[PDB]
RNA sequence: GUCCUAAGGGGGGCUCAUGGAGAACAGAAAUCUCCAGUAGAACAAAAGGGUAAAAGUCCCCUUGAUUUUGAUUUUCAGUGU
RNA sequence: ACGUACGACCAUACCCAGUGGAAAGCACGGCAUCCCGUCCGCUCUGCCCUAGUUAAGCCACUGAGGGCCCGGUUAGUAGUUGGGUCGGUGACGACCAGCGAAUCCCGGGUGUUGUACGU
């Protein structure tokens, strides 16, 4: 018998579009955005961390009825302005991107005429409150040593109150329930990549050149990475909104509209469709 | 002493509040300087009587920590 | 567009299975044979249902298998086609592009006989796959493989002919 | 305006014994010095919550750590009747240990930076003797 | 520009529901201009929001905590219907009526614990449940059996299931009594 | 209920002294216009957290038989319902149903004006966050009738719809959206539903200056058919249970500032 | 029997509650026509005001002089 | 008549019944591989819309077998902490 | 306008096949020391962004067959209530109103949209 029949197609119920695309866990999303211990009607912020092949995407998101709003965004390709040109997806670049997003959020809020109800009803015994967000890892696996927690560590060190434990950081030992902060420092300043460079340079020179061809070409040694990332952190903390210009071709928005509309294929009209139907009928008759 | 929690011999002895050896009692621990993880002050804890009060004229207890 | 390097056929995995049908020492010896052939620990499979005719019970271990990837799978199925004299029959190749064959003596494969383990026959199944299979296997953005990218019975047949110099009857 | 500290920033392990003294650098809060009973002092980077340096060499509990007013030296006074001066941005000891106290050295005091004469710094150590 | 509005009849408030009631008439223009219509409606909305914000900021106490600035609200006063009836006491069961008539006091939580001390083994064990004292001996190696009782024992049955038989009988009796009480309560 | 999760569900569905927040079921008849569906979408967007939505067509006429509505309330634990329909006599109808003890307490029909209806997406403003309750403002003389009428019932139903979750405290940053319902006593009056976002400005005083900006939706209704509650069922539903944290006041017995029980002698 | 309830805090109190009880104890007045029917179990050593400074100095003056000069 | 570190709770990974094509014994029915599979399986209830990166099924951690406090609600208390 | 990250409606978006893709971005991809996890580095995790490639994913268009969604028609019709209101002793036959379907038929369509950053 045929499984895919008219009754099957009629009774079939599709999933959500992003579930079909495999991009959203709605089970996690409902408990992330619609559930709370306190019912004080306050806004909620989530730190969305996503990873691509060549980039790291960090966003600060609130949820509204017609779609999510992005309070601030930082990317690992913006890190070239602070001096990181290689390894934009590694754990250290994740830390630097999280730190950059933290500094941008604080600078946008001014914690680095219209005035708020908090300022209107502030009590004399009132103190500045930290900015709070909850981590959103999406579909990524939360194992010990993942880079979502590197982004979280960078943002927390930058000054965003993210509730977390420390058993998913690199260097944590589950037997002693203790965190090796030397290993954590090595990962923050990118020393694991440097040990990989030295190990390859000692054992397999061909793999060393093939994997780190850009490091050798731009003269980025293994021993310079610690002070390079430290200087990047200092520059991020100093100037969180530095402008970076890419090597991609630059045109205006209307020029890009014209460029894309020149390659867009238009949808056929009713007259053209009827003409094609008549031509097909004539071909079938002939 | 705040209360008598469990006399090991008899629930009637617990109800009467008999202080004997091995009795679990509730004591006021305000003077010991104990705080919880939330910052709250712990002023009531459990101790066990480690002597014979009828023979000694005093109640000696050990905190259960 | 078939000349593109990303449409090159290659072996994805080779699965070696032994279905002894009885739990205990025979299954243990079959697992030992699979382990010494492959280099990795095998997997015990349990019976789904209870069949009184076959003498099996639900949730009882009756079979053992190993999945092998990489050049190890290639050398093992090369040994198996050395055993089978590089001759395959048309029903062995599936409509989805995979194939397989079963042998009756693992001693013929190139391992020394031991009286402790005995003689076991066992079957090979090779899965053929073009690059781009991560699309249907990754957790995030999992989707289907395109129709032109799928491997057909004729494609795996002449791949076998040109690469392994075998005969298909 | 200084705002009230309300939450934990970092919890950094590494000392093997109870901590007896702590002091920030006068230059910035990014560098902290802690002297403990495990015969060591330690420089911490407080931005990332990581260790930076471990100053070893005392054979008693480091009862006191003290940054120089300009922030270029760190003095440690210990239970082993000694005082040592360390370079905080390299982690190495400056010259040798200071000898001459009979008993436990309990407190330190740098001369103020505007009073430094003869091209040098002066350090006062108070001891149990 | 003022932050206080004047109307012939004052507003009323229910700050528990954040509700402001405006009993003054809303003189909607009898025109066809949607612009001035929504302008008048927005003016009324602005007045209502203004008086509600003023009432909340003046007559609710303010507490500044680590979460933020909170206003302590009164309980709601606007009457609203419930979705389900108020809970009522259950009808008394046969045991509860008998205990009320005979003065039988309920057992204390320490008395009714599933724990007891076994002297012979010198250990703490459960009275019932998994490995309970009601199934004592069913896993021991050696059990003496009396000849008369084993002669009266039917064929196939063993002494290792007698306690399970008694437990099942007691469970069946308790279930029958519970079902009888449930049927009587459903009749009432 | 042998299963623990099923026992949890039954205990959640059981009546309580302090009730759970009410749930609204959104559903449509056999025929339903796109304007009615968009209105139901806007109301669901206002009430996403405590609503369930059906997506099929139901052959239900609420003022003829409501046994199916009682069955749906039974199955979904939904005490409020928004039921959409269409007809030649009434082209755009939103039927609000309020339930009690899985039985129909009362019902009211709203007739939507198709020409003045504006959806949420037609206003280009920042929208309300998910789960955040708005404040409510009811304006006009139609809500102060001495006799209970359709406008009083509409006020009660809209308050119960936009009630949200009860809370003794609220953050001052959660006072940013207001829902205004305007209706006048008198040929049939028009009940107007608007949603605004609140902006505050300095005015030189302690109290800020409130300015509003339209958020959507824009709704115009004419009140139609109404099913009133029975008096006994209304009395039972309007009974207010007393919390166990509410002390029964005893004569000459009080609790002082240190918690001691104090007696009074005259 | 071994039980985890023996090693936990039976009574806890917060700093806000302690401050409120301190304010209440400061604002306590005496009324002859009010009778105490049931005492509230409170950590009264943390609530009651401390002894006077002259008493606190005098109560340790003897031991202080003996420690200074044996 | 047997077996079980009990159930439960939280977190994580996976997708089921079935059909087609294939693989020594293996043949309608044993195990393994691929494809198609709105759930047509399982688990609960008695849907006229229960659940699919789960409420299904396997791993990790707890298993402590019914905690403490209360001037509050209801009932009782000649043994009223 | 195109791409990406979160989304809102949740098939006009789904099931199957073909053609094309400037720019960048996604993606396939390369390597298993360290973090981490499997029978299998298949998945997960880490390192590279160099090199190959648009073959697949993805996007746009087209095509059948289904499916799905709108508007009219059905039609104020069947049917349901109402001596309702007129006769009929009454039951009922019209009429009056209130509610109020569906099948069939016709026509159209095969996704709109928010935030942020880029091309």
Swiss-Prot record, chain A:
Q: Which UniProt keywords apply?
A: Cytoplasm, Ribonucleoprotein, Ribosomal protein
Q: Which GO terms describe its molecular function?
A: 5S rRNA binding; structural constituent of ribosome
Extract the CDD domains matched here.
Ribosomal_L18_L5e (cd00432)
* GO CC terms, sorted: cytosolic large ribosomal subunit
Q: Which GO BP terms, alphabetically?
A: ribosomal large subunit assembly; translation
Q: Which InterPro entries does the entry mention? A: Rbsml_uL18_euk (IPR005485), Ribosomal_uL18_C_euk (IPR025607)
Q: Where in the cell is it found?
A: Cytoplasm
Which function does this protein serve? Answer: Component of the ribosome, a large ribonucleoprotein complex responsible for the synthesis of proteins in the cell. The small ribosomal subunit (SSU) binds messenger RNAs (mRNAs) and translates the encoded message by selecting cognate aminoacyl-transfer RNA (tRNA) molecules. The large subunit (LSU) contains the ribosomal catalytic site termed the peptidyl transferase center (PTC), which catalyzes the formation of peptide bonds, thereby polymerizing the amino acids delivered by tRNAs into a polypeptide chain.
> Could you give the subunit structure recorded for this chain?
Component of a hexameric 5S RNP precursor complex, composed of 5S RNA, RRS1, RPF2, RPL5, RPL11 and SYO1; this complex acts as a precursor for ribosome assembly.
As for family, the record states: Belongs to the universal ribosomal protein uL18 family.
> Can you name this protein?
Large ribosomal subunit protein uL18
Q: Which organism is it from?
A: Chaetomium thermophilum (strain DSM 1495 / CBS 144.50 / IMI 039719)
Curated annotation (Swiss-Prot), chain C:
Annotated protein name in UniProt: Large ribosomal subunit protein uL5
Any idea which UniProt keywords this protein has?
Answer: Ribonucleoprotein, Ribosomal protein
Q: Which species is listed as the source?
A: Chaetomium thermophilum (strain DSM 1495 / CBS 144.50 / IMI 039719)
Show the GO MF annotations. structural constituent of ribosome
Membrane-crossing ranges are: none
Q: What does this protein do?
A: Component of the ribosome, a large ribonucleoprotein complex responsible for the synthesis of proteins in the cell. The small ribosomal subunit (SSU) binds messenger RNAs (mRNAs) and translates the encoded message by selecting cognate aminoacyl-transfer RNA (tRNA) molecules. The large subunit (LSU) contains the ribosomal catalytic site termed the peptidyl transferase center (PTC), which catalyzes the formation of peptide bonds, thereby polymerizing the amino acids delivered by tRNAs into a polypeptide chain.
Question: What's in the GO CC field?
Answer: ribonucleoprotein complex; ribosome
Family from the record:
Belongs to the universal ribosomal protein uL5 family.
Assembly and oligomerization: Component of a hexameric 5S RNP precursor complex, composed of 5S RNA, RRS1, RPF2, RPL5, RPL11 and SYO1; this complex acts as a precursor for ribosome assembly.
Q: Which InterPro entries match?
A: Ribosomal_uL5, Ribosomal_uL5_C, Ribosomal_uL5_CS, Ribosomal_uL5_dom_sf, Ribosomal_uL5_N
By its UniProt entry, which NCBIfam families does this protein fall under? PRK04219.1 (NF003258)
Instruction: Please give the superkingdom of this protein's source.
Output: Eukaryota
Q: Name one GO biological process term.
A: translation
Curated annotation (Swiss-Prot), chain D:
Q: Where in the cell is it found?
A: Nucleus, Nucleolus
Renumbered ranges of WD repeats: 14-54, 57-96, 100-129
Q: What does this protein do?
A: Involved in ribosome biogenesis. Required for processing and efficient intra-nuclear transport of pre-60S ribosomal subunits. Interacts with the AAA-ATPase Midasin, which is essential for the ATP-dependent dissociation of a group of nonribosomal factors from the pre-60S particle.
Family stated for the protein in its record: Belongs to the NLE1/RSA4 family.
Whom does it interact with, and what assembly results?
Associates with the pre-60S ribosomal particle. Interacts (via WD repeats) with uL18. Interacts (via UBL domain) with MDN1 (via VWFA/MIDAS domain). Interacts (via WD repeats) with NSA2.
Q: What is this protein called?
A: Ribosome assembly protein 4
Its taxonomic path starts at: Eukaryota, Fungi, Dikarya, Ascomycota, Pezizomycotina
Parent-protein start and end of this portion: 131 to 259 of 517
UniProtKB/Swiss-Prot annotation, chain E:
Pfam families in the cross-refs: RRS1 (PF04939)
Alphabetically list the UniProt keywords: Nucleus, Ribosome biogenesis
InterPro entries per the record? Ribosom_reg (IPR007023)
Compartmental location: Nucleus
For whether the record's keyword set contains Transcription regulation, the answer is no
Q: Name one GO cellular component term.
A: nucleus
Gene Ontology biological-process annotations: ribosome biogenesis
Which top-level group of life is the source organism from? Eukaryota
Q: Region Disordered: what ranges?
A: 72-93
| Complex and partners | Component of a hexameric 5S RNP precursor complex, composed of 5S RNA, RRS1, RPF2, RPL5, RPL11 and SYO1; this complex acts as a precursor for ribosome assembly.
Q: Which family does it belong to?
A: Belongs to the RRS1 family.
What does this gene product do? Involved in ribosomal large subunit assembly.
Name this protein carries in UniProt: Ribosome biogenesis regulatory protein homolog
The upper taxonomy is: Eukaryota, Fungi, Dikarya, Ascomycota, Pezizomycotina
């Amino acid at each position: 018998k045929l499984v895919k029949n008219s009754a099957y197609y009629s009774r079939f119920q599709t999933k959500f579009k992003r579930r079909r695309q495999g991009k959203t866990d709605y089970y996690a999303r409902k408990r992330l955005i619609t559930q709370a211990k306190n019912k004080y009607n306050a806004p909620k912020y989530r730190l969305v961390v996503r990873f691509t092949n060549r980039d790291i995407i960090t966003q600060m998101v609130t949820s509204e009825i017609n779609g999510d709003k992005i309070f601030a965004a930082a990317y690992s390709h913006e890190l070239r302005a602070y001096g990181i040109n290689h390894g934009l997806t590694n754990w250290a670049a994740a830390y630097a991107t999280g730190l950059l997003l933290a500094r941008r959020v604080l600078a946008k809020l001014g914690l680095d005429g219209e005035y708020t109800l908090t300022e209107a009803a502030e009590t004399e015994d009132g103190e500045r409150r930290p900015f709070k967000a909850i981590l959103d890892v999406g579909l990524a696996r939360t194992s010990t040593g993942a880079r979502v927690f590197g982004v979280m560590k960078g943002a927390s060190d930058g000054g965003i109150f993210i509730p977390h434990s420390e058993n998913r950081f690199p260097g944590y030992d589950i037997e002693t329930e203790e965190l090796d902060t030397e290993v954590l420092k090595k990962y923050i300043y990118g020393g694991h990549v440097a040990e990989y460079m030295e190990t390859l340079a000692d054992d397999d020179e061909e793999r060393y050149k093939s994997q780190f061809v850009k490091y050798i070409e731009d003269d980025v040694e293994a021993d310079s990475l610690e002070e390079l990332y430290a200087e990047a952190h200092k520059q991020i903390r100093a100037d969180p909104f530095r402008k970076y210009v890419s090597d991609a071709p630059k045109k205006s928005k209307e020029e890009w509209k014209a460029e894309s509309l020149k390659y867009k294929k238009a949808k056929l009209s009713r007259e053209e469709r009827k003409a094609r139907v008549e031509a097909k009928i004539k071909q079938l008759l002939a | 002493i705040l209360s008598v929690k469990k006399n090991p011999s008899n629930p009637l002895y617990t109800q009467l509040g008999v202080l004997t050896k091995g009795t679990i009692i509730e004591v006021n621990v305000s003077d010991l300087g104990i705080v919880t993880a939330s910052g709250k002050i712990a002023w009531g804890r459990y101790a066990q009587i480690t002597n014979n009060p009828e023979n000694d004229g005093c109640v000696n207890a050990v905190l259960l920590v | 567009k078939a000349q593109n390097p990303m449409r090159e056929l290659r072996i994805q995995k080779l699965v070696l299975n032994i279905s002894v049908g009885e739990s205990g020492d025979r299954l243990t010896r079959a697992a030992k044979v699979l382990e010494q052939l492959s280099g990795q620990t095998p997997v015990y499979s349990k019976a789904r249902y209870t069949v009184r005719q076959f003498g099996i019970r639900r949730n009882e271990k009756i079979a053992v298998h190993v999945t092998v990837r990489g050049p190890k799978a290639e050398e093992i199925l090369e040994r198996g086609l050395k055993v089978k004299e590089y001759e395959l029959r048309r029903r062995n190749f599936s409509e989805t592009g995979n194939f397989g064959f079963g042998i009756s003596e693992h001693i013929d494969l190139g391992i020394k006989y031991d009286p402790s383990i005995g003689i076991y026959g066992m079957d090979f199944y090779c899965c053929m796959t073009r690059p781009g299979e991560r699309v249907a296997k990754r957790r995030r953005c999992k989707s289907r493989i395109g129709a032109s990218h799928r491997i057909t019975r004729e494609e795996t047949i002449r791949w076998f002919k040109q690469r392994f110099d075998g005969i298909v009857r | 305006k200084v705002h009230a500290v309300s939450r934990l920033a970092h919890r950094i392990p590494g000392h093997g014994q109870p901590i007896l003294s702590c002091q920030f650098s006068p230059v910035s809060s990014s560098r902290l010095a802690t002297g403990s009973g495990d015969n060591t002092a330690r420089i911490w980077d407080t931005d990332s919550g990581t260790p930076k340096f471990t100053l070893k060499g005392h054979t008693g509990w480091v009862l006191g750590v003290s940054w120089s007013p300009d922030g270029k030296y760190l003095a440690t006074c210990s239970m082993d009747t000694t005082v040592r001066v360390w370079d905080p941005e390299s982690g190495k000891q400056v010259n040798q240990e200071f000898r001459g106290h009979a008993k436990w050295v309990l407190a330190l005091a740098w001369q103020p930076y505007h009073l430094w004469r003869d091209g040098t710094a002066r350090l006062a150590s108070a001891s149990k003797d | 520009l003022p932050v206080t509005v004047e109307k012939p009849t004052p507003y009323t408030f229910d700050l528990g529901l954040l509700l402001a009631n405006d009993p003054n008439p809303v003189n909607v223009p009898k025109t066809t201009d949607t612009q001035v219509l929504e302008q008048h409606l927005a003016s009324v909305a602005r007045d209502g929001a203004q008086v509600l914000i003023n009432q909340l900021l003046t007559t609710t106490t303010i507490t500044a905590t680590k979460d933020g600035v909170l206003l302590t609200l009164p309980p709601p006063t606007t009457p609203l219907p419930r979705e389900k009836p108020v809970p009522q006491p259950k009808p008394e069961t046969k045991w509860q009526a008998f205990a009320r008539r005979r003065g039988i006091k309920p057992k204390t939580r320490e008395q009714r614990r599933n724990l007891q001390y076994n002297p012979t083994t010198g250990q703490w064990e459960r009275k019932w449940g998994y490995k309970g004292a009601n199934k004592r001996g069913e896993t021991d190696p050696i059990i003496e059996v009396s000849a008369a009782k084993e002669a009266m024992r039917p064929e196939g049955t063993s002494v290792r299931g007698d306690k399970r038989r008694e437990i099942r009988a007691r469970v069946k009796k308790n279930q029958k009594q519970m079902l009888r009480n449930q049927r009587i309560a459903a009749e009432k | 209920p042998r299963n623990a999760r099923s026992k949890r569900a039954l205990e959640k569905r059981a009546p309580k002294i302090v009730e759970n927040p009410k749930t609204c079921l959104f559903l449509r008849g056999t025929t339903c216009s796109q304007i009615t569906q968009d209105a139901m979408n806007d109301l669901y967007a206002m009430r996403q957290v405590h609503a369930k939505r059906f997506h099929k067509k139901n052959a239900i006429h609420p003022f003829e038989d409501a046994t199916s509505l009682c069955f749906f309330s039974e199955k979904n634990d939904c005490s409020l319902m928004v039921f959409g329909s269409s007809n030649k006599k009434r082209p755009h109808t939103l039927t609000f149903v309020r339930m009690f003890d899985y039985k129909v307490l009362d019902m009211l029909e709203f007739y939507l004006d198709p020409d003045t209806y504006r959806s949420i997406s037609q206003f280009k403003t920042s929208k309300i966050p998910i789960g955040m309750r708005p404040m409510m403002v009811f304006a006009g003389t139609a809500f102060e009738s001495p006799v209970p009428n359709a406008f009083t019932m509409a006020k009660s139903m809209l308050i119960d719809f936009f009630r949200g979750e009860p809370s003794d405290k609220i953050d001052v940053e959660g006072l940013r959206f207001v829902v205004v319902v305007t209706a006048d006593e008198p040929q049939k009056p028009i009940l107007r539903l608007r949603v605004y976002g609140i902006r505050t400005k300095r005015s030189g005083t302690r109290l800020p200056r409130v300015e509003v900006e339209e958020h959507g939706p824009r709704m115009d209704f004419r009140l139609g058919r109404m099913r009133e509650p029975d008096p006994a069922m209304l009395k039972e539903a309007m009974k207010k249970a007393k919390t166990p944290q509410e002390e029964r006041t005893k004569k000459n017995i009080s609790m002082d500032l240190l918690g001691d029980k104090i007696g009074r002698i005259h | 029997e071994p039980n985890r309830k023996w090693f936990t805090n039976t009574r806890v109190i917060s700093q806000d509650t302690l401050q409120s009880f301190r304010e209440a104890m400061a604002e306590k007045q005496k009324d002859p026509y009010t009778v105490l029917l049931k005492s509230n179990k409170l950590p009264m050593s943390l609530i009651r005001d401390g002894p006077k400074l002259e008493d606190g100095l005098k109560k340790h003056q003897a031991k202080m002089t003996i420690e200074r000069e044996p």
